[PDB]
Design a protein around this ligand. Structure first.
Ligand SMILES: NC[C@H]1O[C@H](O[C@H]2[C@H](O)[C@@H](O[C@H]3O[C@H](CO)[C@@H](O)[C@H](N)[C@H]3O)[C@H](N)C[C@@H]2N)[C@H](N)[C@@H](O)[C@@H]1O
Ligand SMILES: [Mg+2]
Length: 268
């Protein structure tokens, strides 16, 4: 029997999602199981559990981000620079690798999209506009980004069948941690400004490994190692959403744990 919206809403209530909550979901749809009306059933259940006063924040990114094509260069390669489409936040589809649910969240009516092409976030709720802006190049996940305002606004991380590597909010901990040898990257993004395509080159913290030992491909990063340690030492509400196992995590608490975790292991 495919899961109905109402069943999902009640499981989300059992897990601890309250009216008015600020929630960031990481969803594996395969672990959830079949839904009454496909992935939209889970989106509707999230909106309903969070209520008319709550908020959803999702890391959707961009399907056609020229990250690899421009990473390491002082300027976009000529072939890339002439033909690559500019980031249109109203029509650019989400990145499928971060979850198939994100394209349904971003096309939901009233959803707002942040301006960062590679680190794009989508928000639904009365505080959506406050969440998504500003989001500038050079502040992907660090202070002054949507994740920062999410952390200050009692955000909860809702992992539905996702692994510990999926906690996007922990990249904030990498940004602010006082440790030596933090890796940075340089890449270019095509932005749409006053109707016109403009290429912008910036540098930011390497979101694929803040230090060399976490940048390996094979290859657990700092985010996964922090999350595994956290989940082994912390009481966290656990339960099923659909057929997937889910955890509701206090975002400020795990980020705070991540800063101490990184700073205890690497001198300043
Ligand atoms: N390093 C190990 C981790 O890698 C990926 O997670 C990363 C993404 O790679 C990164 O993405 C960036 O780099 C990609 C590859 O160059 C580009 O395609 C993409 N546009 C660009 O946003 C996110 N920003 C942060 C996230 N933790 C895997 N999901 C995760 O399971 C694994 O633990
Ligand atoms: Mg409010």
């Amino acid at each position: 029997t495919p899961w109905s919206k109402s069943e999902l809403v009640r499981q989300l209530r059992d897990l601890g999602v309250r009216s008015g909550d600020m929630v960031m979901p990481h969803v594996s749809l395969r672990a959830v199981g079949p839904l009454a009306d496909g992935p939209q059933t889970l989106v509707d259940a999230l909106i309903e559990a969070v209520g008319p006063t709550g908020n959803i924040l999702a890391f959707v990114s961009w399907r056609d981000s020229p990250y690899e094509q421009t990473l390491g260069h002082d300027a976009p390669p000529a072939a890339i620079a002439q033909s690559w489409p500019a980031f249109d936040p109203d029509h650019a589809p989400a990145y499928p690798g971060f979850g198939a649910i994100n394209e349904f969240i971003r096309t939901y009516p009233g959803c707002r999209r942040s301006a960062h092409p590679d680190a794009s976030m989508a928000a639904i709720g009365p505080d959506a506009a406050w969440l998504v802006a500003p989001h500038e190049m050079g502040a992907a996940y660090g202070p002054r980004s949507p994740i920062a305002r999410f952390l200050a606004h009692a955000g909860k991380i809702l992992s539905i069948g996702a692994g510990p590597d999926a906690v996007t909010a922990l990249h904030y901990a990498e940004a602010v941690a006082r440790i030596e040898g933090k890796r940075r990257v340089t890449y270019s993004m095509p932005l749409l400004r006053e109707g016109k395509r403009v290429w912008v080159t910036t540098s930011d913290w390497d979101s694929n490994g803040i230090l060399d030992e976490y940048a390996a491909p094979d290859g657990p990063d700092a985010v996964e190692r922090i999350a595994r340690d956290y989940l082994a030492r912390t009481r966290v509400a656990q339960g099923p959403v659909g057929g997937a196992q889910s955890r509701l995590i206090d975002a400020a608490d795990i980020v705070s744990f991540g800063i101490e975790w990184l700073e205890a292991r690497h001198a300043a």
